[PDB]
Design an enzyme around this catalytic site. Structure first.
Site, PDB file in Angstrom:
ATOM      1  N   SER A  58      -7.945   1.235  12.433  1.00 36.98           N
ATOM      2  CA  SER A  58      -9.004   1.966  13.113  1.00 36.98           C
ATOM      3  C   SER A  58      -9.638   1.129  14.208  1.00 36.98           C
ATOM      4  O   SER A  58      -9.997  -0.022  13.959  1.00 36.98           O
ATOM      5  CB  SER A  58     -10.051   2.429  12.109  1.00 36.98           C
ATOM      6  OG  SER A  58      -9.551   3.480  11.299  1.00 36.98           O
TER       7      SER A  58
HETATM    8  N1  LIG Z   1      -5.877  10.727  -0.046  1.00 37.71           N
HETATM    9  C1  LIG Z   1      -5.831   9.446   0.323  1.00 37.71           C
HETATM   10  N2  LIG Z   1      -6.280   8.510  -0.545  1.00 37.71           N
HETATM   11  C2  LIG Z   1      -6.276   7.226  -0.172  1.00 37.71           C
HETATM   12  N3  LIG Z   1      -5.860   6.693   0.981  1.00 37.71           N
HETATM   13  C3  LIG Z   1      -5.403   7.640   1.817  1.00 37.71           C
HETATM   14  C4  LIG Z   1      -5.357   9.004   1.576  1.00 37.71           C
HETATM   15  N4  LIG Z   1      -4.791   9.673   2.652  1.00 37.71           N
HETATM   16  C5  LIG Z   1      -4.508   8.715   3.499  1.00 37.71           C
HETATM   17  N5  LIG Z   1      -4.842   7.461   3.059  1.00 37.71           N
HETATM   18  C6  LIG Z   1      -4.607   6.182   3.729  1.00 37.71           C
HETATM   19  O1  LIG Z   1      -5.708   5.897   4.561  1.00 37.71           O
HETATM   20  C7  LIG Z   1      -5.284   5.000   5.609  1.00 37.71           C
HETATM   21  C8  LIG Z   1      -5.877   5.427   6.937  1.00 37.71           C
HETATM   22  S1  LIG Z   1      -5.891   4.015   8.071  1.00 37.71           S
HETATM   23  C9  LIG Z   1      -7.598   3.413   7.929  1.00 37.71           C
HETATM   24  C10 LIG Z   1      -7.595   1.953   8.362  1.00 37.71           C
HETATM   25  C11 LIG Z   1      -8.946   1.229   8.068  1.00 37.71           C
HETATM   26  N6  LIG Z   1     -10.134   1.784   8.720  1.00 37.71           N
HETATM   27  C12 LIG Z   1      -8.772  -0.244   8.448  1.00 37.71           C
HETATM   28  O2  LIG Z   1      -9.065  -0.639   9.596  1.00 37.71           O
HETATM   29  O3  LIG Z   1      -8.319  -1.001   7.494  1.00 37.71           O
HETATM   30  C13 LIG Z   1      -3.753   4.963   5.568  1.00 37.71           C
HETATM   31  O4  LIG Z   1      -3.299   3.714   5.066  1.00 37.71           O
HETATM   32  C14 LIG Z   1      -3.385   6.126   4.638  1.00 37.71           C
HETATM   33  O5  LIG Z   1      -2.202   5.873   3.886  1.00 37.71           O
END
Ligand SMILES: Nc1ncnc2c1ncn2[C@@H]1O[C@H](CSCC[C@H](N)C(=O)O)[C@@H](O)[C@H]1O
EC number: 2.1.1.77
Length: 207
Positions: A58
């Site tokens: 992000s």
């Molecule tokens: N239902 C769910 N439960 C948990 N994680 C989820 C999800 N749906 C998606 N994700 C995960 O959420 C992530 C979004 S990326 C977010 C990155 C974070 N802000 C950082 O900088 O570390 C991805 O890895 C995806 O696999």
């Protein structure tokens, strides 16, 4: 250092990093260490860099907005939904000055292994905890939470996270509405909810 000093100052004048506490966390946190070796050169750029399995680290603006909205103070219990790289988790850890805990859930086992790995390389282990599981379900093993950060786009606000939010708790959840996703802030007033709308955000959907 210079790219990090320029980034957070650029963010400050845009009116994203209103809090000095949030800014210090950004400056402290090396994004290079959460990105995969090849994206190290572009780590300081303010755009969501690609990650394996649909994840994207992000952007530094997306992260500052969410930290700013959860009102960072020391001794916070925080639930980060969708760990990914775990970059956001280290930024929340510095924002709370390492006092408290960042509980962070990730649907992808592989992704959780990478986030937990980076969080150990810098010294966030203990302060930050990684769980392989469902974001919608949340962590009822450690709930209620002071702040819940949803780093993925929900179709509708999961009721399991409003209930996992303690009295006065903030939840910053991107909800996929018409003409895109709207970053929402949810405030809990004992038994009453306060669903407030911020800016139009671009986030990966929640599973
Ligand atoms: N239902 C769910 N439960 C948990 N994680 C989820 C999800 N749906 C998606 N994700 C995960 O959420 C992530 C979004 S990326 C977010 C990155 C974070 N802000 C950082 O900088 O570390 C991805 O890895 C995806 O696999």
């Amino acid at each position: 250092a210079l790219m990090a000093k320029r980034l957070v100052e650029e963010l400050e004048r845009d009116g994203i990093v209103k809090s000095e506490r949030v800014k210090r966390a950004l400056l402290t946190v090396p994004r290079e260490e959460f990105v995969l070796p090849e994206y190290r050169m572009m780590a300081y750029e303010d755009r969501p860099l690609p990650l394996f399995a649909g994840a994207t680290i992000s952007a530094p603006h997306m992260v500052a907005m969410m930290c700013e909205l959860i009102e960072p103070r020391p001794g916070m219990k925080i639930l980060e939904v969708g760990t990914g790289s775990g970059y956001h988790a280290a930024v929340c850890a510095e924002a709370i000055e390492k006092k408290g805990r960042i509980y962070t859930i990730e649907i992808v086992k592989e992704l959780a292994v990478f986030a937990a790995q980076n969080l150990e390389r810098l010294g966030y282990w203990g302060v930050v905890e990684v769980y392989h599981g469902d974001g919608k379900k949340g962590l009822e093993k450690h709930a209620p939470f002071d702040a819940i950060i949803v780093t993925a786009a929900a179709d509708v606000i999961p009721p399991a996270l409003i209930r996992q939010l303690k009295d006065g708790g903030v939840m910053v959840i991107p909800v996929e509405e018409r003409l895109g996703q709207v970053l929402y802030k949810v405030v809990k007033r004992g038994d009453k909810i306060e669903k407030k709308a911020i800016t139009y955000v671009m986030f990966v959907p929640l599973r």
